[PDB]
């Protein structure tokens, strides 16, 4: 049930497709990265998660480059998909903007974003 | 110069291939996640980084599962590739193990790993 | 308005006192660290935040040692206090358990905890 | 052996005093936060760490405000002190700048800083 279209609390939509081998592909839009543009996402997840009831570990990388804009930065999400009546993707993300060696200390951000299927 | 075989300070080898579209593919081995096994990695990077001299924003996801072992966890690296006389990949990473809703607060780890081409 | 008693979404209570010099003192309880025990907290904040409307940069650390239990770990919170009709403390935290040099890669956790005044 | 004057890889000096109760006090200087200014630090650590050989859990908060400069920011270090022939403090830090609700996603930074006693 991981495949689908997901939305975060800031409105950023997360269209994702899961493969049987554990692949993860999709797109990203809506502000937080860049205002209105498509960004290609790719990551991985485990195809055989625990059967006792537990979040499905997954993650994906989105580098903000496309045919229009390029912020020289990538946010790489890492969380687990919690199934149930309402599907949830609670993730922690690290936006790493490409900086010089002097500014490399302030290059990487960190945060959290929770994704739901309804919006 | 981003494509190649990379090693972290703990000995974990990071074989990576970069595509012209910004794709990032490879494998991960050597202990830190699991002792001796191949793990598929996929991520992204910007194909047109800044020309003034700056790290190339990149990232990759590795869900720790293969044909042999499955730790129900995904380790997700996010950093920038710094070129020069010696190539360097300074990254922050978030290993998110799949846990229950009760243990979801202790699911995600954070760290750093720097990758060089020589070992 | 930063001083008070705060609660996170997991029920952990955050009693805090702010000083005019920017000091931050209080206690921490309720499960997430240890089941039922008082833990001393100390941190800092800026006593002259921006007047245009912005979160107040604050942070604190709690090391789980007391007269009863000792987990050899510290979670060190860093966030900003957002004032308004409902007071909010949105924080990111890093639980660093004391490990050996071999396990030092898995020592530090990361997460988020939001604190409100009502519970 | 935790009390002393510590230096990170980027020249930032970390003068710290530890108390028997587990307290932690000191100052911070040298660029990364602000170019040349004193910044008050206070934190905590466990006074009874493991005796089998392991890092001593510690943390501290520094809010960049003083009598001269105020960046409305706090970097809140969380790491363990590793003793031995050379004393080491390997820490992860989260710099949270006080931002508005719109910019609150890009408020918190993440990184690492290792502190040694020699410089």
Swiss-Prot record, chains A, B, C, D:
One of its GO terms (molecular function) is biotin binding. A motif (Cell attachment site) lies at residues 44-46. Its main location: secreted. GO terms for cellular component: extracellular region. It is found in: Secreted. Residues 1-119 form the Avidin-like domain. The keyword Signal applies. Biotin binds at residues 28, 39, 77, 93, 105. Keywords: Biotin, Secreted, Signal. Belongs to the avidin/streptavidin family. Homotetramer. The biological function of streptavidin is not known. Forms a strong non-covalent specific complex with biotin (one molecule of biotin per subunit of streptavidin). This is Streptavidin. It comes from Streptomyces avidinii. The chain holds residues 40 to 158 of 183 of the full protein.
């Amino acid at each position: 049930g991981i495949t689908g279209t997901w939305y975060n609390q800031l409105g950023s939509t997360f269209i994702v497709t899961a493969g049987a081998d554990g692949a993860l592909t999709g797109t990203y839009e809506s502000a937080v990265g860049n205002a209105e543009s498509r960004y290609v996402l790719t990551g991985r997840y485990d195809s055989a998660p625990a059967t006792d009831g537990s979040g499905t570990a997954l993650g994906w990388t989105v580098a903000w480059k496309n045919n229009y804009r390029n912020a020289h930065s990538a946010t790489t999400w890492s969380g687990q998909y919690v199934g149930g009546a309402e599907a949830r993707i609670n993730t922690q993300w690290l936006l790493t903007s490409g900086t010089t060696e002097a500014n490399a200390w302030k290059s990487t951000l960190v945060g959290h974003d929770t994704f739901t299927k309804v919006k």
